[PDB]
Amino acid sequence: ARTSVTRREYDEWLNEAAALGRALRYPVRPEMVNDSAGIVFGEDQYDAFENGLWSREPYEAMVIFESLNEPAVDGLPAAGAPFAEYSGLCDKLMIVHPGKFCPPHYHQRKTESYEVVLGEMELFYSPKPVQVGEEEVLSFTGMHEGSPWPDGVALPIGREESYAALTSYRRLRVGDPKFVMHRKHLHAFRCPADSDVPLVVREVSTYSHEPAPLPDWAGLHDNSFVAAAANSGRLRTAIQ
Amino acid sequence: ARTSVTRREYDEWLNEAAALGRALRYPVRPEMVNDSAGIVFGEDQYDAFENGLWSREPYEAMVIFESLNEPAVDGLPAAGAPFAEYSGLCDKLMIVHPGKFCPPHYHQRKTESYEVVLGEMELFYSPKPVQVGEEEVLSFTGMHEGSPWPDGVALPIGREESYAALTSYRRLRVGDPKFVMHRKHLHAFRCPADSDVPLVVREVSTYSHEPAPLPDWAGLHDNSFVAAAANSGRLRTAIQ
Amino acid sequence: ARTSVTRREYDEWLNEAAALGRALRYPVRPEMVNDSAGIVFGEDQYDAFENGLWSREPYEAMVIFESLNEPAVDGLPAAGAPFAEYSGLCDKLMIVHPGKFCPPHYHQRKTESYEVVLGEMELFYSPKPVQVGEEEVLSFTGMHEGSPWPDGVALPIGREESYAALTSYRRLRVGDPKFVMHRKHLHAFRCPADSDVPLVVREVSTYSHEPAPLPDWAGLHDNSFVAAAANSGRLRTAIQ
Amino acid sequence: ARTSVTRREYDEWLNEAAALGRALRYPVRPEMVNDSAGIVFGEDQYDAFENGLWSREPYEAMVIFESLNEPAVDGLPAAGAPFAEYSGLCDKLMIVHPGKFCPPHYHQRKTESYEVVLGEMELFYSPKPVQVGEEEVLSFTGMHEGSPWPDGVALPIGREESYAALTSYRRLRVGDPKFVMHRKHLHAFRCPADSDVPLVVREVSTYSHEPAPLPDWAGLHDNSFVAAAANSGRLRTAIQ
Ligand SMILES: [Mn+2]
Ligand SMILES: [Mn+2]
Ligand SMILES: [Mn+2]
Ligand SMILES: [Mn+2]
């Protein structure tokens, strides 16, 4: 069971990913292609590189080039500081290879939108949000129900369970309408294992908190993954 | 002095603009190409169509295809409703022809980011925000100073003044970093008059209020144009 | 019945076409955007501009940006001069708006290939080549049969006849294999009248003779259009 | 000294190259992505894979997706068969990684054109053609002189000499005019070692003879590489 990705493996992975992005017209500047864009969700997932990203095997891994992550604090009424973290502007391109996933997780503050740039995205999610604290929350459009998963979705071994709660399915393609994923909703997507290209999608969402706009913003955790193993990973990718 | 755009003029304008968008890989669906995307800022500006969009003359006009404008209310703490309008997710592509402008204006709630897809964008703005009400506002990164205007920027006749306060300049190109324009800041951009293609840019910003997420969101005006004439226009484009 | 295209009409037509080209990644340099790229096939066809290129009306018109047209004479054996004209390298992008056609014609020397860049191309042609002279010609792969025309192909009024001989149909899309159109074959294509974007296609073919590589190449006519009217046009477009 | 490329190495190499192609809008169909597109020029060059394609090391290797290679025999006068091989239509996209080369070689029949799709191409060539046989050859535009090589062009070890005769230099970029390379001219290009993306270029040339349009076309060799070692390779790539 591999426990890390080699330097060559990582660089080629993010270097191909970077060029594929620019071609697809995304402003990926070298500053952004770094030892953090490449993500492996868990020590169990480093086996993704035992056969390669073109192996078509079910693993939790991806690359994320972030071009923007504006807090949007400036100009906001002082009385809005308490809730300023539920706002903000994040823009990032994500690259997922055939068969690979972006593990089941939900965000307390972040609300995301998806725009397929290349390939097809099989989105999985829970139509019901999670009750984060006894506090009262607003409603409006919520998350619709969606469709039944298509047959044959191979899930990473040992993470089979983390997908249970994500009953709703959705197939987003290039050209489709923008898809909104409200905070507090369990989501996860994958690139069809039999894809001919890597899934590529522009994520326009609210601020991305990653472990100072405001003092109370200091190291906030906004990523909550079902499978605990995934949590010990998103933090960084072990590169030899 | 023409006082409206003919049906053919408008359709060709938005239909070229629509195709140009899809080619540049923006998800412009026909639903979005409507009698509203095409905007003429003021009765004084319908003269843009006397010689055409490729006349290279200084006029205030543009097309905006909006793919997303999510309120981001769902999942927000009830106690955040008062400030929920300062958040939200808007995604739109804008097309500005050579010599044309997006008139001087500022938003009280909206914070924008720019990503040049095609061409070059000559951004003009005021380094100081405006004092909207006696209420207290937050700070953090603010707006940097920028550079002096390049010589020879022809401004639309009769609107010469509205650009005065926008002393800071900036030339954003394809590939450059995401450019953030904080709310309360006077902004305005143009496509260089001697351009060979239309300027095209992806605007990722906070919710765009246009004349119901929450009761108090009912018909909110978040667009404040310097030149009053521009105001009586953004509302709609007179098409014969 | 309009008998010419105005300067603004022409410029806007080729200027939108030019930018759409670069966006689709075709090397359209300004030298190429000239008073010749825009083509109207016959005086009967200037009525295309009566309602516009977005009229969706059946007319023979198009724009052709030629990036290459190499004779490929250098390095060729002296003994090959007689047949050097059937060789050469031409590279051009073509833009056809919804409902418009590229009139029925055949080339004696030129053999073309099509690559759909944007939109869909409805190709019409004759499965049998024409007997040009009593001279003996070679064979090999020839032109396959193809399919029946789909219902509802509106043809330009008065040119209805010139399409008779082109019984074979073919719908080429972006991604499809390269389609080869051998010389001596009657062809003509159009952009589906109900298209949402202009048809755009990369034509890679042999040398394009337009009214000196070799003395005998001096002003050669390699374009032979069925409808006589089309012939007196391809020469130039009447611009006011 | 590695003497072959592993299955995974090969696949990932061509799989990334294939998707990069489609993104840049080239019609790369799966049939085209095969155990031949990936090319290693010589057993001395398999060490390219010891550190990877992103090693930035000087090696002779590349991938070539061929979409068209029409003989253009059909419709040609019987009396033209002797010279039909100097004609034809080849269309292919080529992918060269940072620091890698396309070894010095010349073609007796083929004449090529280059169009940079992505990156920058540093083309090297000899301004004088080679005298292939006592036969007489035609002339017209020939090959201009060009420029001095830029300092610091690292050449693959052991092949340093094969570049000597290619004294003329040229830097072709996206948007530049079509570049024509006449047959009988020694050429070779590379992607700048410090490139951020792989060089990608559309090669539109005459028929590409690879070891039956006409009987005398049977297995013709039109590729003549300076370094002998390169010749024993282009034939096939050793994959474990
Ligand atoms: Mn997420
Ligand atoms: Mn604005
Ligand atoms: Mn033709
Ligand atoms: Mn060659």
Side-chain angles (χ1 to χ4, degrees):
Chain A
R2 297 198 52 173
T3 70
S4 81
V5 183
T6 71
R7 191 77 231 152
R8 178 191 178 163
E9 294 187 317
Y10 189 85
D11 298 315
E12 310 213 307
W13 167 30
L14 272 76
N15 279 316
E16 288 314 293
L20 183 59
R22 317 209 65 177
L24 286 178
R25 304 186 172 292
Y26 191 77
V28 180
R29 318 244 300 145
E31 316 182 72
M32 303 164 28
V33 183
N34 69 82
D35 276 6
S36 296
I39 298 181
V40 190
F41 303 84
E43 59 271 288
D44 196 51
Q45 303 306 295
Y46 284 84
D47 266 325
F49 284 97
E50 256 304 61
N51 292 294
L53 266 41
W54 281 96
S55 48
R56 308 214 129 80
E57 302 164 299
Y59 286 93
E60 316 201 296
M62 71 184 296
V63 45
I64 307 177
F65 294 129
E66 171 170 291
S67 63
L68 173 60
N69 192 56
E70 173 56 61
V73 192
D74 295 276
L76 181 65
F83 308 100
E85 81 243 51
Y86 283 60
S87 176
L89 302 159
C90 158
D91 190 319
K92 60 186 57 157
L93 193 67
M94 315 181 300
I95 282 77
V96 171
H97 283 53
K100 266 57 182 185
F101 297 74
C102 164
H105 73 276
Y106 75 72
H107 315 274
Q108 193 205 304
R109 297 138 256 254
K110 193 175 80 146
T111 278
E112 324 175 327
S113 74
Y114 309 111
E115 170 188 313
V116 179
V117 165
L118 182 55
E120 310 216 296
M121 177 182 167
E122 295 186 10
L123 177 55
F124 307 109
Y125 61 111
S126 192
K128 252 69 181 56
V130 308
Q131 197 184 177
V132 179
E134 284 167 51
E135 188 172 298
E136 202 192 4
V137 287
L138 289 159
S139 333
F140 186 55
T141 175
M143 286 290 306
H144 55 199
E145 204 195 16
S147 315
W149 290 41
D151 301 23
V153 166
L155 303 189
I157 295 70
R159 303 296 172 79
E160 347 263 9
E161 191 59 49
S162 56
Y163 296 61
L166 286 63
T167 70
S168 291
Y169 178 72
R170 167 69 78 154
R171 182 83 174 194
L172 306 146
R173 305 174 198 189
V174 203
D176 287 46
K178 275 267 173 172
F179 193 64
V180 165
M181 180 57 64
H182 299 292
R183 50 173 81 81
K184 263 76 152 194
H185 284 285
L186 282 175
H187 65 277
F189 56 72
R190 79 140 195 187
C191 181
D194 73 308
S195 199
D196 53 291
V197 293
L199 162 74
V200 189
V201 26
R202 281 181 177 242
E203 184 202 301
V204 179
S205 69
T206 64
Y207 194 88
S208 275
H209 297 292
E210 196 272 80
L214 296 178
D216 50 327
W217 271 48
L220 262 56
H221 310 293
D222 210 44
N223 306 285
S224 186
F225 304 56
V226 176
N231 266 31
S232 72
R234 177 96 97 153
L235 314 100
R236 218 181 184 180
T237 300
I239 317 180
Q240 300 188 195
Chain B
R2 291 198 60 181
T3 65
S4 68
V5 175
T6 63
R7 192 83 246 176
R8 168 169 151 178
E9 292 189 298
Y10 189 85
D11 293 325
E12 305 192 304
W13 173 31
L14 287 79
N15 279 295
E16 283 331 300
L20 175 35
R22 325 185 84 281
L24 282 175
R25 283 180 193 289
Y26 192 93
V28 189
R29 299 171 62 66
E31 321 164 285
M32 289 169 59
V33 179
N34 44 70
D35 273 18
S36 266
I39 306 182
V40 196
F41 295 105
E43 337 307 322
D44 206 43
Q45 305 296 290
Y46 285 85
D47 257 4
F49 285 88
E50 264 299 64
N51 296 319
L53 302 310
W54 285 90
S55 33
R56 294 196 184 83
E57 318 176 327
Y59 285 101
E60 308 188 311
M62 68 192 309
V63 55
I64 302 180
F65 298 120
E66 163 195 295
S67 69
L68 172 63
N69 195 330
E70 169 55 49
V73 180
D74 287 282
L76 194 87
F83 307 102
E85 57 229 67
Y86 285 79
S87 189
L89 293 179
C90 178
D91 199 345
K92 47 179 79 172
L93 182 92
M94 309 179 279
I95 296 95
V96 192
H97 281 92
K100 271 51 178 176
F101 291 84
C102 160
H105 64 304
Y106 82 78
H107 316 299
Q108 177 194 309
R109 291 161 252 290
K110 209 175 69 166
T111 293
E112 321 178 307
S113 64
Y114 301 120
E115 193 208 304
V116 186
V117 167
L118 176 78
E120 297 197 307
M121 174 182 144
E122 305 230 12
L123 176 56
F124 305 111
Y125 69 109
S126 187
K128 276 81 193 62
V130 308
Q131 215 290 295
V132 190
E134 192 71 299
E135 65 248 72
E136 202 195 26
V137 292
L138 307 166
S139 308
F140 186 41
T141 152
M143 298 293 290
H144 346 68
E145 271 187 5
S147 322
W149 287 35
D151 290 2
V153 174
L155 312 194
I157 288 68
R159 296 290 227 278
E160 355 259 9
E161 262 318 81
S162 60
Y163 296 74
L166 298 79
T167 60
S168 293
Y169 176 71
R170 252 287 186 163
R171 191 195 193 74
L172 298 148
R173 313 159 186 193
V174 167
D176 285 21
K178 283 282 185 182
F179 200 106
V180 186
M181 172 80 47
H182 296 290
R183 44 171 76 86
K184 266 104 162 177
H185 277 282
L186 285 192
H187 57 299
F189 56 53
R190 85 152 187 168
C191 174
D194 91 322
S195 178
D196 23 309
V197 295
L199 162 61
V200 185
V201 26
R202 276 168 172 267
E203 188 204 316
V204 166
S205 68
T206 73
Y207 199 97
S208 204
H209 303 292
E210 335 119 49
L214 296 182
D216 43 314
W217 273 47
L220 254 49
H221 311 291
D222 206 66
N223 304 32
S224 180
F225 300 68
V226 183
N231 268 58
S232 85
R234 168 89 83 151
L235 302 108
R236 282 177 164 301
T237 294
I239 303 178
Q240 329 185 179
Chain C
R2 294 182 65 172
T3 52
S4 66
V5 191
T6 82
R7 199 40 159 171
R8 172 176 164 178
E9 290 178 313
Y10 188 88
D11 281 36
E12 318 204 309
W13 177 19
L14 267 70
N15 273 18
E16 286 317 320
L20 176 60
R22 337 282 294 302
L24 296 168
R25 307 196 87 81
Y26 193 97
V28 170
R29 323 185 82 283
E31 5 167 87
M32 288 152 59
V33 187
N34 56 62
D35 292 315
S36 309
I39 300 181
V40 178
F41 295 89
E43 300 303 287
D44 194 352
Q45 296 309 293
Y46 291 111
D47 284 294
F49 279 85
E50 249 306 78
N51 304 307
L53 246 46
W54 274 106
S55 69
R56 294 179 188 286
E57 306 188 335
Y59 284 101
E60 308 183 334
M62 71 187 288
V63 42
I64 316 187
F65 300 114
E66 192 181 88
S67 62
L68 183 59
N69 193 348
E70 186 56 49
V73 144
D74 283 89
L76 184 76
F83 310 104
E85 42 183 331
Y86 291 69
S87 28
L89 303 197
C90 186
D91 193 317
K92 34 177 63 185
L93 185 63
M94 302 169 281
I95 301 72
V96 182
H97 286 64
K100 269 59 171 173
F101 299 81
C102 175
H105 67 280
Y106 93 71
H107 303 264
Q108 174 190 298
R109 289 82 165 184
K110 212 179 78 181
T111 285
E112 35 192 290
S113 93
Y114 311 124
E115 174 195 305
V116 198
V117 180
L118 185 63
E120 285 202 290
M121 170 171 114
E122 274 186 67
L123 183 74
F124 307 112
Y125 63 123
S126 63
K128 288 295 81 183
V130 336
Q131 193 262 58
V132 217
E134 317 192 310
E135 132 89 286
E136 209 278 4
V137 309
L138 303 170
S139 176
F140 164 34
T141 67
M143 286 297 269
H144 282 74
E145 198 181 17
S147 309
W149 290 39
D151 307 340
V153 184
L155 308 166
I157 288 58
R159 303 289 225 289
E160 272 86 351
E161 261 316 79
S162 74
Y163 295 68
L166 291 53
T167 68
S168 295
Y169 175 80
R170 196 76 193 188
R171 190 148 194 147
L172 316 183
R173 319 190 181 185
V174 196
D176 272 30
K178 254 275 165 49
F179 192 82
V180 169
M181 178 69 65
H182 294 311
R183 46 174 89 76
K184 291 185 171 45
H185 276 81
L186 322 183
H187 58 301
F189 45 82
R190 71 151 191 170
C191 162
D194 57 295
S195 167
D196 263 359
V197 299
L199 164 68
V200 186
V201 53
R202 278 179 164 276
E203 179 193 304
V204 232
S205 53
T206 60
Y207 186 88
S208 171
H209 297 281
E210 319 144 317
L214 296 185
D216 41 313
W217 280 43
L220 271 49
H221 340 298
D222 202 48
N223 284 215
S224 182
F225 305 87
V226 197
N231 286 303
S232 168
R234 176 81 140 159
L235 291 96
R236 286 200 283 286
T237 300
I239 301 174
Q240 302 180 177
Chain D
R2 288 188 53 186
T3 46
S4 65
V5 187
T6 79
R7 187 79 274 179
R8 182 184 167 173
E9 294 186 321
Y10 188 78
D11 273 50
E12 312 226 299
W13 178 29
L14 281 76
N15 278 315
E16 282 309 292
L20 189 79
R22 316 184 91 290
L24 297 160
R25 286 178 167 162
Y26 189 75
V28 185
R29 0 219 306 91
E31 303 90 287
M32 307 170 75
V33 174
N34 54 56
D35 285 30
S36 299
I39 293 179
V40 165
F41 299 91
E43 293 306 309
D44 194 27
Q45 304 299 303
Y46 281 85
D47 298 317
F49 294 76
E50 247 308 57
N51 296 311
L53 279 323
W54 283 90
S55 60
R56 302 184 169 293
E57 317 177 307
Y59 283 100
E60 314 188 321
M62 81 185 287
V63 43
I64 293 182
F65 301 111
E66 164 179 292
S67 71
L68 180 60
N69 192 16
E70 190 60 36
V73 158
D74 289 283
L76 212 80
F83 302 105
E85 69 232 58
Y86 285 52
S87 163
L89 297 187
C90 184
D91 195 313
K92 34 193 184 172
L93 175 76
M94 302 178 263
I95 272 70
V96 176
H97 287 67
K100 272 48 177 175
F101 293 91
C102 164
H105 66 279
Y106 74 84
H107 312 264
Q108 181 193 79
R109 311 162 170 84
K110 212 184 63 181
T111 296
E112 352 175 312
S113 63
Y114 309 124
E115 169 185 300
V116 176
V117 178
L118 188 70
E120 299 197 324
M121 178 193 165
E122 296 187 24
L123 167 47
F124 307 110
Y125 63 106
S126 193
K128 229 96 274 296
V130 309
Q131 213 173 179
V132 187
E134 299 182 73
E135 179 188 11
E136 239 304 358
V137 305
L138 309 184
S139 24
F140 172 65
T141 168
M143 287 299 296
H144 44 182
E145 243 192 7
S147 317
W149 279 35
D151 313 16
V153 177
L155 315 175
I157 273 63
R159 302 295 172 71
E160 345 273 20
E161 233 280 312
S162 54
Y163 296 82
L166 293 69
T167 67
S168 302
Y169 172 78
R170 282 199 106 297
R171 193 188 198 53
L172 308 177
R173 316 177 173 182
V174 220
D176 276 342
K178 287 274 183 172
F179 191 95
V180 175
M181 175 64 66
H182 297 296
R183 31 175 106 86
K184 302 176 165 302
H185 279 292
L186 288 174
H187 53 282
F189 54 84
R190 79 158 191 174
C191 162
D194 69 300
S195 205
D196 46 304
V197 293
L199 146 63
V200 182
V201 59
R202 276 162 167 274
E203 183 198 288
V204 179
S205 83
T206 81
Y207 194 87
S208 213
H209 303 288
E210 323 298 70
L214 290 170
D216 38 310
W217 273 52
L220 247 62
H221 294 313
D222 200 29
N223 290 297
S224 305
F225 306 81
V226 186
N231 296 44
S232 200
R234 178 79 89 85
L235 288 158
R236 313 145 176 296
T237 293
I239 307 177
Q240 292 168 186

